[PDB]
């Protein structure tokens, strides 16, 4: 994995020694070269994972999240370069350095052989994201979110730390490869119940869980575009990756500890999708859509069937691409009308036809139009949860109505109807913006041809 | 009720509007033209029976139970004209009604495709910008204290000036682009 | 009552401006100034070359793989002659005629 | 389809409707004949004339404008406004 970490670190002398008009071009070029390099991780096997060293490994779960992570950096550099034009050059290089450092943390978070190195890199990803959100977020009003981050630290990552140190003392190792063969059944006891909550609640907030999703339509709103792209595309999926690693140790107690949280997600995707029908803020609507889609990944991990893991990792990759494109479309209107109000600028297909085509395609991938991998992930999760319980199809299908309903409403409000009269700064689409939409959508459409590379280790 | 110029409906306006809506809903009830024309003169006689009513309270009550008569006898789906609100062709071409300022955002290679049009549009915009401050200083000395009472605007008073708040009414899109 | 003289004057002035705008939306005889830029080729490009491509695909890549094109076996009647064998199927029983 | 309207056409059609009306004589009717004061009609008759215009041209005049059209020239000017004639 050291053929990826070292070029990502060499992006730091590349971004600090570059000429002042060249720092976007150079970082975009070399991060696209790293993303082309990232396809060497597709050397996967039907029995063995790709095990590089004592520190790094890659099965077919971590590999597509790595490719999506290394692909997300050039797109963030394209998306965030317009609204940093009047920024200081040194502050602009600090922004690019925090993006590069976040990629550096993520690409060795997903490959972490041992679980406390996963914990260190997992909680290391929060700091450059925090600095990007609070130094370039264009407004900061976080009176209620401070107490929620305190709740995240109390109920989340610290019990995970104590639990992983406990497994280190009990099993003697936290290597996931060793824990594949030295796993003991975790029986019914109160010690094992608090053990399960400690191993799971950090990743429950990171997904997020319904009821615990209070941070996500704030942190998505108060962020720049690169921060919202990396939150929607990668930083939610650390929770799902960590659940799919840590549920190896949590058998068979998961088979009766999943029942509350499954309810919290199965009803929760009914609520948040419905919440998207009453959103004034477009970026908040995409945030609650992200909650409504990660609820299915929570259910699919907690029911731990093969079809559910295949659908959950396909849904993670697909929703990463789709929701990142949705935030980029929301920014491509916000950079013109200077307000996130979804009822402000209407009828935009009269003014921007190709951009409305991109809105249509991102909406159709948002509502899981087949054969897109949004639908493949959605569908396999629905099949596995039907095998879990035959009634849940109702709570699936009703969600699959409301998921359609706000997806086209977001299309109908922003793009259709009568244009707003008093807005006359609606410029034509820059080639940068259309390139950003295409570099989201065309990989998402090409993955419908060959979905087997995004269906996880047990395809 | 809700009008741009008047804050209410006069009783004369209420009578005329109820007569018109009664005839329209009647024509919806009474499809054939000679049959509707017969019942239309009958209904005109019914409206002209109490045309000469001096008492405005009695005329108010008669108008009220006439509204009850019209509501009891209304058609469920009355004939709406196609480009009337509620019609089948209503606001159909609003997706083709591009605002004029978008011509400002064209590329010069396609602005040069229509040279006379934009060469005239330059002096249209010139006319607008040398009319604007004159019509603002026209409106600031005629508007009473507290703002204007009614939404109606005064016309161009001097010769050479243009009427105030005129550009979006003149340069509005055509109804069939 | 109709309009006021102020409203009639404003409608006349706006109407003159509106008709000038609509008349000045017309086109010049040179406009648009454009920049300076086989009877049955349809059945060749759209049919015959795709029939070639799809016949090559089905003949050398699809039917060369097992069970890809599975066909219902043809309907055999009494009296038929089998081409793979040379065997004549015998007829039915003689009819207990009804009419 | 959809033939262009002209002020000659709109004028001749509005006067053609009003000359088929049994309370307006066809010899006193001009292009500036006021309905209440010059032709001596009722507001009920004026509403019937605006509804006849709606029957003639295939669209609707709203009541806030139907209460003020008090000559055939105002009718021709209003249809000129709502149809964009003489492009």
């Amino acid at each position: 994995m050291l053929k990826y970490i070292i070029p990502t670190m060499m992006l730091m002398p590349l971004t600090w020694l570059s000429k002042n008009s060249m720092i976007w071009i150079n970082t975009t070029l070399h991060s696209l070269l790293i993303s082309l390099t990232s396809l060497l991780l597709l050397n996967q096997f039907g029995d063995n994972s790709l095990n590089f060293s004592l520190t790094f490994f890659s099965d077919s779960l971590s590999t597509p999240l790595l490719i999506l992570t290394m692909w997300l950096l050039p797109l963030m550099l394209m998306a965030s370069q317009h609204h940093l034009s009047k920024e200081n050059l040194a502050r602009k290089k600090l922004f690019i350095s925090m993006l590069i450092l976040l990629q550096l943390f993520l690409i060795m978070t997903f490959t972490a052989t041992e679980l406390i190195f996963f914990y260190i890199m997992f909680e290391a990803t929060l700091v450059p994201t925090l600095i990007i959100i609070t130094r370039w977020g264009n407004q900061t009003e976080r009176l209620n979110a401070g107490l929620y981050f305190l709740f995240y630290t109390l109920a989340g990552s610290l019990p995970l730390l104590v639990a992983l140190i406990y497994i280190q003392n009990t099993m003697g190792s936290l290597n996931f490869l060793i824990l594949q063969y030295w796993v003991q059944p975790m029986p019914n006891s109160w010690s094992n119940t608090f053990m399960w909550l400690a191993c799971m609640m950090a990743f429950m907030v990171k997904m997020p869980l319904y009821g615990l999703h209070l941070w996500l339509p704030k942190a998505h709103v108060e962020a720049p575009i690169a921060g919202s792209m990396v939150l929607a595309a990668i930083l939610l999926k650390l929770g799902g990756y960590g659940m799919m690693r840590i549920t190896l140790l949590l058998n068979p107690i998961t088979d009766f500890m999943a029942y509350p949280f499954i309810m919290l997600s199965l009803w929760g995707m009914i609520m948040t999708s419905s919440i998207c029908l009453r959103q004034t803020d477009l970026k908040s609507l995409i945030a609650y859509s992200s909650v409504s889609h990660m609820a299915l990944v929570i259910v699919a991990i907690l029911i731990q069937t093969p079809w559910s893991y295949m659908g959950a990792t396909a849904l993670m990759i697909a929703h990463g691409l789709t929701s990142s494109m949705l935030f980029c479309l929301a920014n491509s209107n916000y950079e013109r009308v200077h307000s996130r109000t979804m009822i402000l600028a209407r009828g935009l297909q009269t003014l921007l036809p190709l951009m409305a085509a991109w809105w249509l395609l991102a909406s159709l991938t948002n509502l899981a139009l087949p054969p897109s991998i949004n639908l493949i992930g959605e569908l396999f999760v629905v099949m596995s949860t039907f095998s879990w319980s035959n009634i849940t199809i109702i709570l699936m299908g009703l969600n699959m109505v409301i998921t359609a309903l706000y997806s086209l409403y977001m299309l109908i409000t922003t793009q259709r109807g009568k244009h707003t009269h008093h807005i006359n700064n609606i410029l034509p689409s820059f080639t940068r913006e259309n390139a950003l939409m295409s570099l989201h959508m065309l990989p998402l459409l090409l993955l419908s041809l060959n979905p087997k590379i995004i269906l996880g280790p047990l395809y | 009720a809700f009008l741009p110029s008047a804050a209410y409906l006069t009783h004369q306006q209420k009578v005329l509007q109820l007569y018109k809506r009664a005839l329209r809903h009647l024509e919806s009830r009474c499809v054939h033209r000679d049959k509707y024309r017969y019942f239309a003169c009958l209904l005109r006689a019914r409206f002209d029976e109490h045309k000469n009513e001096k008492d405005m309270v009695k005329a108010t009550q008669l108008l009220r139970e006439a509204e009850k008569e019209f509501w009891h006898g209304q058609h469920p789906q009355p004939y709406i004209f196609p480009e009337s609100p509620g019609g089948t062709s209503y606001e159909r071409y609003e997706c083709y009604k591009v605002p004029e300022w978008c011509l400002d955002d064209w590329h010069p290679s396609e602005k040069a495709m229509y040279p006379d049009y934009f060469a005239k549009r330059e002096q249209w915009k010139k006319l607008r910008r040398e009319s604007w401050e004159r019509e603002v200083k026209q409106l600031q000395e005629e508007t009473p204290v507290g703002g204007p009472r009614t939404e109606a605007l005064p016309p161009a008073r001097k010769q050479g000036d243009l009427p105030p708040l005129w550009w979006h009414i003149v340069t509005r899109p055509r109804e069939r682009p | 009552s109709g309009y006021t003289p102020d409203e009639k004057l404003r409608l006349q002035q706006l109407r003159e401006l509106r008709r000038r705008w609509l008349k000045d939306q017309e086109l010049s005889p040179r406009e648009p100034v454009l920049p300076p830029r086989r009877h049955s080729i349809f059945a060749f490009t759209h049919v015959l070359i795709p029939v070639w491509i799809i016949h090559y695909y089905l003949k050398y890549h699809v039917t060369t793989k097992p069970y890809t094109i599975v066909e219902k076996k043809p309907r055999i009647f009494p009296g038929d002659t089998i081409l793979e064998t040379g065997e004549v199927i015998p007829p039915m029983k003689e009819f207990p005629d009804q009419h | 389809d959809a033939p262009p309207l002209t002020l000659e056409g709109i004028k001749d059609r509005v006067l053609y409707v009003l000359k088929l009306y049994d309370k307006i004589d066809p010899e006193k009717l001009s292009v500036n004949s006021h309905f209440m004061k010059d032709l001596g009609l009722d507001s009920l008759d004026q509403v019937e004339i605006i509804m006849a215009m709606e029957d003639e041209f295939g669209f609707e005049i709203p009541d806030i404008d139907a209460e003020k059209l008090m000559c055939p020239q105002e009718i021709v000017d209003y249809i000129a406004d709502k149809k964009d004639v003489y492009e």
Partner: peptide, 13 residues
């Protein structure tokens, strides 16, 4: 004759 100009946004970009 009487060709009319159709206002539309810039299809160049």
């Amino acid at each position: 004759g009487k060709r009319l100009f159709i206002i539309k946004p810039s299809g160049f970009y």
